[PDB]
Structures are given as structure tokens and as C-alpha cells.
């Protein structure tokens, strides 16, 4: 199973945007027409589909200090990887 394609299906189900514009290299903010409240609804749906909690506060803190890039958390191919890590950490 592709975690990205799972994530893209959730984004398409929530936002009024076509599935074909949702690509692995797309930034969830900045590249897709998605604002902060739309993303919180997407996060909630991600959190439930995968049984995890996206650590949105701590991720944004990490980027603020430069110890992480926006791309490693919010470009979709990388978001899929972060999700897999969270799911694995749940063990």
C-alpha cells in the first residue's frame, strides 16, 4: 500500500481540488489551495485513518528553529514518510 496515495485520497475528499493536482512533490500549504483550517480538517482525517496524532505544534516549532525544513513535514511524499514513522512508533 502507498501511504502517499492514501493521504492524497484524504486531501481530495476534504478540499475542493482535483485529485490529479495532488502530487508527491506538492507542498500541502503553498502549492495546493489549502488554508490553515482546511489543513486542520485534513489532519484530523489523517489522524483517524492512520490511528496517529500529527504533532503539528512540535513540527512547526522544529521548522521555526531551522532544525527541520518545511519540506520534510509538509511536502506530501515526505508527509507520507512521517506518517509511517508515527504509525511504527505507536508500537
Amino acid at each position: 500500500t502507498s501511504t502517499f496515495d492514501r493521504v492524497a485520497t484524504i486531501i481530495a475528499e476534504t478540499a475542493d481540488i482535483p485529485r490529479e493536482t495532488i502530487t508527491p512533490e506538492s507542498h500541502a500549504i503553498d502549492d495546493l489551495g489549502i488554508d490553515e483550517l482546511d489543513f486542520l480538517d485534513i489532519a484530523f482525517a489523517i489522524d483517524k485513518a492512520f490511528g496517529i496524532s500529527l504533532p503539528l505544534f512540535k513540527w512547526e516549532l522544529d521548522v521555526y528553529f531551522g532544525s527541520a525544513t518545511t519540506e520534510q513535514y509538509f511536502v506530501l511524499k515526505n508527509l507520507a514518510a512521517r506518517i509511517d514513522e508515527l504509525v511504527a512508533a505507536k508500537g
Partner: antibody
Amino acid sequence: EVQLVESGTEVKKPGASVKVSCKTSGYIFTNYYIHWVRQAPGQGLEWMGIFNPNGGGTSYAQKFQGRITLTGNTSANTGYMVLRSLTSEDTAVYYCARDPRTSGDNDGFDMWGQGTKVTVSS
Amino acid sequence: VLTQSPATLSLSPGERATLSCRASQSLSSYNYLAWYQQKPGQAPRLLIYAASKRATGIPARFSGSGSGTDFTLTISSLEPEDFAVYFCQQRSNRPPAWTFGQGTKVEIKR
């Protein structure tokens, strides 16, 4: 046991600068932030700032911006705080506490030091 | 800013304790609130984080609830060791900042 231990010279003259050390042990130093919190006698907790051992970044409460410097030495597993231009109002117990950088479990100030006194007095 | 009410709760052992914390604005920062217990001469101790998640090793009689502007810490039945001061705490980004409430004292009613 995870442990944080504060240390420093207690009695400081007004106008002087005090340096407090927070020696940590029992956990991966670069996986947690270091927060500094102080408590004047009889008062509540007052957050002062956050230090990030990964990259050395900081964020200070508005009240202390310009007067405070937070640093660290990861090889020594130790965070430091410098508060300058001390007055009577800086007399307090000073705490360091940890906060996970990369985890959702115990997502808070989960372990604190015992606190060390700074008394600003002539 | 966080506001804690009341400043003092006077209750007997075994009674339910309800502590309140109100924020300046609805908590934009993911509805996050943390509660800490502090006894005299002791460091604060984390009880609750993310408004509702109990920290490791905290007894089940402590529960947290609320969202937006208003939160509560509930101690379903007070044990003798629970008489202490309790602080709530919020956090925000842009810029990173943390603030504490002024604290609520749970004391022994007589």
C-alpha cells in the same frame, strides 16, 4: 532516572549578571528542549525562555528579551542561562525543565530540576 | 494570558475537585493545555498535557477536559497527597512562547 540539576552562585549584586547551569542526565540531550522557569518567593511560575540544543536556537519571553541569553553544551549535556542587569525583582528560584522535541508522549514539561536560588542583594 | 479559578478550593478528603483555567483567546495552538502539581519546596510535576492526556505515572483520578477558551482539571476524589497548588499552562508558536496560570490552591476544609 532522567535528571536535571541546577547550579549557580546564589547572592548577586544588583546590576550584575548571573549564570545558572542545568546539568542533565539519563536521556538523549538533543531530543529535548530546555525551558527555564522561575518562581519568586510566594509567587507562581513564570516562563523565561526555551533553548534548542539542535542548532542552538532560542525564544525568550518578552519580559526578558535583551537581558537573557540561553546556551548549551551538548557534549556536556548542560544548558545555561545568563540573566543580566539583575534587580530585587529577579530574586527567585530558577528551574530548568525538559520538553520533547520529537515525540507526542508526555508532551509537556515532563521533568524538572530541583531549582536553585538567585538572591539579588547588596 | 491564563486565568485560574478559584484561587483557593477548600475541600475535604474524598470529595471531587474541579479546577478551572480560562485563556485570553480560544486556544489556536491546537487546543493544548497542560496541568502541573506543586507541593512546598518541590518542583512542579506534569499531570495532564494536550488538555486530556495523563502523563506517565499519574493516577487515574486526575482528568483534564475542555477546549478553546475554557479548561478544567478534575480530581474525582481527593486523596491526602492531592492537597497542593495546581498550575495550568498554554503554548503558542509565532513566536514560540509558554505561559502559566497564577495557580489554584487545594486546601483542607475544616
